[PDB]
Design a protein around this ligand. Structure first.
Ligand SMILES: *[C@@H]1O[C@H](CO)[C@@H](O[C@@H]2O[C@H](CO)[C@@H](O[C@@H]3O[C@H](CO)[C@@H](O)[C@H](O[C@H]4O[C@H](CO)[C@@H](O)[C@H](O)[C@@H]4O)[C@@H]3O)[C@H](O)[C@H]2NC(C)=O)[C@H](O)[C@H]1NC(C)=O
Ligand SMILES: *[C@@H]1O[C@H](CO)[C@@H](O)[C@H](O)[C@H]1NC(C)=O
Lengths: 47, 335
């Protein structure tokens, strides 16, 4: 349901709504660590 | 100067941010009014974390400036802004070419200058970043050739939409690990190289709105685990290859607004995962017997199917040589 290859055509959208977090670890920001990488590929982790 | 910082490494970040604050020509959200004082970790947009070098010391680890319309240019004083890995500067009115001094950001992991007014050639400084895995320069005015050195690096995502590239797709495309790549709304000339199937990991891919030509390189069938394949609004000519039946994991495909000829195969078009298979606004003498029943989504408009409605005037459907290109002797499809 969520395809980032097509959502890239929308200049305004982002892979992660939560600001500060990395686009790969777009989950709850208990510590909000910019140096933590949850997922490996940017298709299984879209938000 | 009468300020002391927690460490020496955040001192350089203060120098970069204040100089980069002086490069802010506009900020309607007043998100930069907080950028005063030595307590950099409380600035809006920057974020701190214990340094991977030593957990005793904390450093500016990332900068996040999502939409927040911000205007200006990136000054070369950002080279002091070391250890940052995420640089989300999207949807803000920044200008000027990416500074060469950003090559000092050896820890750059994801770089997000999407939806900006950056006008340059391609950023040959964005190639010195070894840890870079996410790169998007979409909705920018970049010009010229796309360097083949980009795909040789272990990248995970490459976004190039809505730019002004004018070269051809490099033959090095096969060497890329890049899960997702986007060439949409660009002026890519030439043919698709026959080195795709050397991917083995490509998930999504798009080619919407390009001035690309040539018969389809049949080696695309080797993409066993691929999800999105799109070639809309292109000038592709020829028939659909039969070897594309290897795309077992494909979920959506689009081939509209092209000048394809030939036959539609019924073999792969019945895939349990394939959805919204659009081939409208094309030429197809073949039939879609199993390829408009409503368990999935198919589009057959302006396709010249006599049995199907919404076709094109027989005077517009093949009033020229009804022979497709042979897809043989063609430099883009074989010998
Ligand atoms: C199944 O697949 C089909 C074919 O891909 C798909 O139809 C397409 O839908 C997209 C939208 O998802 C259409 O794209 C729009 O096209 C119009 C012109 O007709 C543009 O003006 C639009 O751009 C506006 O919106 C953008 C996003 O907000 C803005 O960034 C932009 O500046 C414009 O304001 C937009 O690109 C596309 O036209 C159709 N295809 C055709 C042939 O019309 C269909 O939606 C898919 N069904 C699904 C998703 O289930
Ligand atoms: C796709 O399948 C190949 C074949 O084993 C594998 O090496 C590769 O890691 C897979 N990539 C994915 C799951 O995207």
């Amino acid at each position: 349901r969520r395809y980032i290859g097509y959502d890239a055509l929308k200049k305004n959208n982002v892979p992660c709504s939560r600001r500060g977090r990395s686009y790969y670890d777009c989950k709850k920001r208990r510590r909000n660590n910019p140096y933590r990488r949850g997922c490996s590929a940017i298709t299984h982790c879209y938000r | 100067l009468d300020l002391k910082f927690a460490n020496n490494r955040l001192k350089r970040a203060y120098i970069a941010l204040q100089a980069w604050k002086k490069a802010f020509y506009s900020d309607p959200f007043n998100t930069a009014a907080n950028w005063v004082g030595p307590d950099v970790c409380s600035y809006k947009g920057v974020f701190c974390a214990p340094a991977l070098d030593d957990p005793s010391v904390l450093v500016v680890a990332g900068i996040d400036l999502n939409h927040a319309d911000i205007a200006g240019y990136l000054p070369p004083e950002l080279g002091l802004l070391t250890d940052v890995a995420l640089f989300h500067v999207n949807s803000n009115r920044f200008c000027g070419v990416i500074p060469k001094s950003l090559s000092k950001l050896t820890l750059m992991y994801e770089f997000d200058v999407s939806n900006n007014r950056f006008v340059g050639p391609f950023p040959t400084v964005a190639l010195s970043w070894p840890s870079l895995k996410f790169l998007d320069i979409r909705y920018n005015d970049f010009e010229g050739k796309l360097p083949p050195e980009i795909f040789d690096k272990d990248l995970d995502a490459i976004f190039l939409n809505n730019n002004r590239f004018e070269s051809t797709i490099p033959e090095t495309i096969g060497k890329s690990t890049a899960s997702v790549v986007t060439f949409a709304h660009n002026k890519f000339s030439g043919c698709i190289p026959k080195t795709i199937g050397q991917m083995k990991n490509l998930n999504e891919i798009v080619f919407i709105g390009n001035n690309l030509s040539g018969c389809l390189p049949n080696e695309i069938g080797s993409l066993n685990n691929v999800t999105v394949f799109d070639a809309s609004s292109n000038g592709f000519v020829g028939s659909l290859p039969s070897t594309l039946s290897g795309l077992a994991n494909v979920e959506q495909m689009d081939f509209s607004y092209n000048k394809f000829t030939g036959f539609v195969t019924d073999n792969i078009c019945k895939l349990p995962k394939l959805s919204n298979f659009t081939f409208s606004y094309n030429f197809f003498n073949g039939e879609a017997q199993s390829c408009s029943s409503q368990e999935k989504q198919f589009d057959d408009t302006s396709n010249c199917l006599q049995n199907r409605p919404n076709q094109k005037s027989a005077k517009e459907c093949l009033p020229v040589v009804s022979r497709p290109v042979d897809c043989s002797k063609d430099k883009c499809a074989g010998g």
